[PDB]
Amino acid sequence: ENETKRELVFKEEGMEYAQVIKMLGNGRLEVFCFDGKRRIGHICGRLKKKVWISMDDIVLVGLRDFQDDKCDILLKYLPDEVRNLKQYGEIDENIKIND
RNA sequence: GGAAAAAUAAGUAAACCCUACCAUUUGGAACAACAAGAAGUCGUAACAAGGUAUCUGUAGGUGAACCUGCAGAUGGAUCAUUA
Ligand SMILES: [Mg+2]
Ligand SMILES: [Mg+2]
């Protein structure tokens, strides 16, 4: 089971990798960013449609210049995209991915 | 005789204190909401006889809605049965 293979997308400049910490509501969450900062993310209008996100998922996060404290949830990683990220050496090898 | 200074008595009374207030703003320890939205939590009170009909007053209980007592209203789920 999976949605069609598409290229694992990396953190471009202005984005950061993140892991979901707790659930807020109104389509919001607290994320731990691999920037090293906690932020409060809002979920994309795109993602609100397609991909349901939950706790401890690994997500890509589009950042904001002005408010660093808020960030936008960009895309969710499939656990395979994640293990691949670890392979590539983008995100640290000690991280908990749950199924 | 006139008359400056200086003094005198009573008054007008500014300003500064003490008391007690009113008005228009304002600083403030300590408390601390409300409306809107939705992919957080616990349950499911209400809409159907919401699965114990709701609802009003009151009173008591109580994670949460709510629950129970008494009197009341159909906005009721009855306009209606002496033989
Ligand atoms: Mg809710
Ligand atoms: Mg009470």
Angstrom distance (rounded) from CA A78 to CA A99: 10
Neighbours of A14 (CB within 10 A): 9
Angstrom distance (rounded) from CA A55 to CA A77: 13
Angstrom distance (rounded) from CA A40 to CA A19: 12
What determination technique applies here?
A: X-ray
Q: How far is the CA of A28 from the centre of ligand 1 (A)?
A: 14
Q: How far is the CA of A47 from the centre of ligand 2 (A)?
A: 45
Q: Dihedral angle at the C-alpha atoms of A37, A65, A13, A53, nearest 10 degrees?
A: 60
Nucleotides of B under 7 A from a protein CB: 37-41
